[PDB]
Amino acid sequence: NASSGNRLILTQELHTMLQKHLFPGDGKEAAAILICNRYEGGRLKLLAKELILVPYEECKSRTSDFIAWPGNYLEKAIDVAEEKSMSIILIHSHPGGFLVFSDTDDSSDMQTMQSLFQGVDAIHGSAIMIHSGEMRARLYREGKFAENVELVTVAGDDIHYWWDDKTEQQLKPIAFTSGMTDTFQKLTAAIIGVSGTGSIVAEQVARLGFGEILLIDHDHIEKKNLNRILNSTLKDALSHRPKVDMFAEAIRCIRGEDISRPINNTIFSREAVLAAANADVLFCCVDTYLARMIADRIASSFLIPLLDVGVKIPTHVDPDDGRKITDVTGRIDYVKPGGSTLSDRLVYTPELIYRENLNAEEYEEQLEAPSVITLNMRAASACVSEFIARCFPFREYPNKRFTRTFFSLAGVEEDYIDESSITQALNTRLAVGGEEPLLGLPELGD
Amino acid sequence: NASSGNRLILTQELHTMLQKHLFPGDGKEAAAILICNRYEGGRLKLLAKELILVPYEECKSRTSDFIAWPGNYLEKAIDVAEEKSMSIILIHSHPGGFLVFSDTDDSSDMQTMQSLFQGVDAIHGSAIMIHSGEMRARLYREGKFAENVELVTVAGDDIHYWWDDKTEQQLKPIAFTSGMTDTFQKLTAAIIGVSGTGSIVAEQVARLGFGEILLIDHDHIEKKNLNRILNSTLKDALSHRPKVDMFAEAIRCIRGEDISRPINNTIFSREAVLAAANADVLFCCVDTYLARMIADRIASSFLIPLLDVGVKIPTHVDPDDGRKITDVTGRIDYVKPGGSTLSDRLVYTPELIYRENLNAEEYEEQLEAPSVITLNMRAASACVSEFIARCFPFREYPNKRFTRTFFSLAGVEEDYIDESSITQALNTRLAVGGEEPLLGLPELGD
Ligand code: NA
Numbered sequence: 001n002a003s004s005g006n007r008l009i010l011t012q013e014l015h016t017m018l019q020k021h022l023f024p025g026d027g028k029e030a031a032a033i034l035i036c037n038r039y040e041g042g043r044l045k046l047l048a049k050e051l052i053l054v055p056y057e058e059c060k061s062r063t064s065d066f067i068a069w070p071g072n073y074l075e076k077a078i079d080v081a082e083e084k085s086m087s088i089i090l091i092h093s094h095p096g097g098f099l100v101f102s103d104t105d106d107s108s109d110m111q112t113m114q115s116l117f118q119g120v121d122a123i124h125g126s127a128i129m130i131h132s133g134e135m136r137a138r139l140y141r142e143g144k145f146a147e148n149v150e151l152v153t154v155a156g157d158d159i160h161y162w163w164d165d166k167t168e169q170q171l172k173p174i175a176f177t178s179g180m181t182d183t184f185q186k187l188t189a190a191i192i193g194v195s196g197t198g199s200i201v202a203e204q205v206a207r208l209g210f211g212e213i214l215l216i217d218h219d220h221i222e223k224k225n226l227n228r229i230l231n232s233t234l235k236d237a238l239s240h241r242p243k244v245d246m247f248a249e250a251i252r253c254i255r256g257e258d259i260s261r262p263i264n265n266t267i268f269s270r271e272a273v274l275a276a277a278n279a280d281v282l283f284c285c286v287d288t289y290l291a292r293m294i295a296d297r298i299a300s301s302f303l304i305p306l307l308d309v310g311v312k313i314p315t316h317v318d319p320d321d322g323r324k325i326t327d328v329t330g331r332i333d334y335v336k337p338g339g340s341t342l343s344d345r346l347v348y349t350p351e352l353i354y355r356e357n358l359n360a361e362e363y364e365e366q367l368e369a370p371s372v373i374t375l376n377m378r379a380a381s382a383c384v385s386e387f388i389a390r391c392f393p394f395r396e397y398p399n400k401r402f403t404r405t406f407f408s409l410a411g412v413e414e415d416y417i418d419e420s421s422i423t424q425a426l427n428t429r430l431a432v433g434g435e436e437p438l439l440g441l442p443e444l445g446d
Numbered sequence: 447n448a449s450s451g452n453r454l455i456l457t458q459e460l461h462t463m464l465q466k467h468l469f470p471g472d473g474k475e476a477a478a479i480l481i482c483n484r485y486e487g488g489r490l491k492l493l494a495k496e497l498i499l500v501p502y503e504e505c506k507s508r509t510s511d512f513i514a515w516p517g518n519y520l521e522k523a524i525d526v527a528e529e530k531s532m533s534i535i536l537i538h539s540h541p542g543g544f545l546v547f548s549d550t551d552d553s554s555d556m557q558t559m560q561s562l563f564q565g566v567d568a569i570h571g572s573a574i575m576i577h578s579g580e581m582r583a584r585l586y587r588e589g590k591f592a593e594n595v596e597l598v599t600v601a602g603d604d605i606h607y608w609w610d611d612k613t614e615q616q617l618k619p620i621a622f623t624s625g626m627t628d629t630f631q632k633l634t635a636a637i638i639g640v641s642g643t644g645s646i647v648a649e650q651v652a653r654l655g656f657g658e659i660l661l662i663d664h665d666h667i668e669k670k671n672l673n674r675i676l677n678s679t680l681k682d683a684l685s686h687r688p689k690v691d692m693f694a695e696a697i698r699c700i701r702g703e704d705i706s707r708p709i710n711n712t713i714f715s716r717e718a719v720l721a722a723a724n725a726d727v728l729f730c731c732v733d734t735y736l737a738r739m740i741a742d743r744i745a746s747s748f749l750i751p752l753l754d755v756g757v758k759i760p761t762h763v764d765p766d767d768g769r770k771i772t773d774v775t776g777r778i779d780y781v782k783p784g785g786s787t788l789s790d791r792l793v794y795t796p797e798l799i800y801r802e803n804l805n806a807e808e809y810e811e812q813l814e815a816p817s818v819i820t821l822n823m824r825a826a827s828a829c830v831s832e833f834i835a836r837c838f839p840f841r842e843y844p845n846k847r848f849t850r851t852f853f854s855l856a857g858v859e860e861d862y863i864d865e866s867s868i869t870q871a872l873n874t875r876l877a878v879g880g881e882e883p884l885l886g887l888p889e890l891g892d
């Protein structure tokens with residue numbers, strides 16, 4: 001499938017360190033080793049986890065077109081990878097060259113990939129980088145060539161997609177053009193919540209040409225939903241139709257192809273998490289602290305960029321006038337793997353999740369923003385535009401300045417927070433993939 | 447129908463003058479006369495055109511609960527109305543009172559309405575105002591009571607809807623609540639252009655609960671349209687389905703009721719103009735100078751508030767990088783009857799319309815914003831929110847400050863222009879209704 005391609009994902013931080021080591025300035029090849037976890041869902045994703053730099057002095061020969069792999073650094077990589085059968089990717093630079101593997105590279109790989117597989121029974125591979133930072137990679141199974149990596153990607157402040165070469169033109173597209181659609185057609189988007197905002201995110205993702213669209217929601221269409229959920233009908237409400245099934249069918253009719261994957265479940269489930277982990281981008285549109293935390297942990301664990309959107313209309317009672325709107329607000333948060341998280345930004349806290357679960361049990365035992373499509377659309381359009389701006393930069397300022405966006409329609413103000421202003425906690429789950437218990441939550445354990 | 451109610455429409459300027467005369471501060475009743483044109487479409491609309499203030503000194507008696515109508519001012523009103531059979535509305539104030547017609551008012555009307563009809567064979571009526579400016583009115587046919595006016599309205603910087611009293615609660619609703627839906631259910635919206643922006647405007651108007659939705663467009667769904675037009679399907683494109691018929695059917699399914707009126711024609715037609723003139727609000731979403739001028743003239747002629755929206759993505763070729771986005775922009779203009787127009791704001795000019803028509807003929811004889819739903823949604827959501835903000839004020843600043851809105855997503859700036867900063871030309875077509883040739887354009891003549 002156009003939505004079954006494999007992935008090698010590096011964090012921005014690891015990629016920056018790698019590029020700096022591979023291009024010291026003397027124009028000679030240099031070497032490094034990436035040790036990766038894997039997620040083997042509908043597509044294979046290699047998740048860069050550890051980096052070993054091969055010192056220049058340790059390489060018996062370094063020239064502008066060759067580097068000798070010191071055997072003991074292969075062994076050091078085997079020693080890191082052995083316990084969890086991690087994938088080992090050997091990387092070298094092509095200063096003054098091109099992103100093409102040479103005959104020497106092929107013949108070297110034939111030797112080194114057999115050594116790596118004898119050390120660790122796992123998929124391994126090799127990669128090359130040019131000075132710009134762009135990479136190509138390929139994988140070897142049982143120590144013998146299997147396949148190129150379709151996509152090497154880094155979701156930084158800007159999102160970088162480096163595609164395996166084809167005979168067709170593959171220039172980076174400009175925002176809002178048809179090359180944009182070409183990129184999106186090879187990507188998978190996950191919509192968490194087919195909500196007031198999420199149905200609008202999903203509509204845009206569909207019409208922008210994304211190749212696979214996961215829809216995650218356990219809720220149903222109701223009469224109260226009809227003022228907000230795109231594509232929903234009165235008939236849908238009268239049969240309490242699941243939101244994900246309604247929207248999957250809409251996408252099928254819009255696109256002429258069954259490219260949506262409806263998951264009728266809460267995001268707090270093994271089913272939803274394992275499906276979402278396959279995606280190339282997460283859009284979190286569920287207005288609970290729990291859901292935002294799950295999305296946060298998926299994004300870190302599986303190295304997926306995350307866009308989180310919320311809106312609010314707080315009200316108060318005025319002594320003289322009665323109930324009044326207090327404010328009308330929206331928030332868009334972009335989270336890059338290894339950058340500050342939703343937790344760091346206090347979008348949720350342990351206490352807020354605790355109180356929210358208690359209140360849900362109180363509401364269960366016992367058993368103001370009613371018409372808000374305009375606000376939902378104002379926020380959801382900004383949310384998807386943020387993804388476009390990071391894939392195909394078009395703003396007059398660096399994308400890092402817009403890491404958080406807050407707007408008020410009552411105060412007619414919009415403010416931006418730069419990534420560098422956000423304190424970061426230690427991120428223990430980065431690139432751990434599906435290590436059990438899933439996301440560190442025993443409730444999701446196997 | 448809930449969409450067949452009649453209307454008495456005053457301009458903000460006339461209403462302000464009327465209220466000032468009716469409430470000089472001595473707490474005694476005062477009197478004035480409104481002379482109105484009419485539009486008799488699917489609903490009767492009285493369009494306030496001229497105002498005669500009855501001087502306090504000319505009234506034989508003025509008390510806190512009575513005023514004597516001087517007969518010669520009825521004759522002056524007859525003399526103004528005679529040529530074009532205009533409707534005459536007698537207005538007096540209720541200082542310290544309520545918006546209820548008294549027995550004295552009923553008995554007075556029985557006399558004066560017969561005199562008015564003997565003078566001018568037309569519908570006439572009477573109205574009352576309290577100090578706040580709120581009004582009630584009723585109409586007399588052949589000089590005898592016929593019916594109350596369902597809605598007296600002034601579209602100023604704020605939009606005022608004064609509804610005929612019912613046994614049910616009728617408090618002014620707060621933005622984004624259910625009372626909002628109650629107001630909208632009695633209104634007619636006209637969507638000019640079921641375009642990238644117009645289909646999103648129409649979707650919001652539908653789900654917000656508007657009672658009647660006119661859709662005006664001659665264009666069809668095509669494959670190139672599927673990345674932008676809400677509710678459109680591949681099947682729609684394969685049969686080149688008219689946009690208005692596609693969207694009318696969507697609205698029927700969404701709302702469970704056939705409340706849309708699809709007009710498969712250009713706005714530059716007698717059919718479209720006469721349909722639009724029935725509306726309570728115009729949304730202009732067609733990106734031609736001609737269409738914006740027609741909408742401008744409809745709004746002035748029939749006293750309809752107008753929201754005009756456009757977006758642009760100018761591009762340029764960079765010597766070093768190739769084609770680049772120059773800017774990514776949107777514009778929302780609110781036009782109130784008697785306020786500055788789209789012409790005043792140079793949204794179109796005679797020269798721009800002339801050149802546009804020549805280029806269309808050049809293109810005819812001979813025979814960059816391709817994927818832009820996110821921008822269309824960002825602009826269309828702001829456009830409908832602007833209507834909400836003026837009907838149910840919720841901003842921390844006066845609505846007049848936001849008469850024009852300009853935003854750039856590339857420069858990350860949004861600017862507002864106040865009505866008071868815009869120069870106004872003489873507005874010769876204000877409240878002339880369907881005087882021929884329609885809109886002053888011989889091409890639309892009968
Ligand atoms: Na970090």
Ligand code: NA
Pocket residue numbers: 784785786870871873
């Ligand atoms: Na004027």
Ligand SMILES: [Zn+2]
Pocket residue numbers: 092094101102105128
């Ligand atoms: Zn090489």
Ligand SMILES: [Zn+2]
Pocket residue numbers: 538540547548551574
């Ligand atoms: Zn009275």
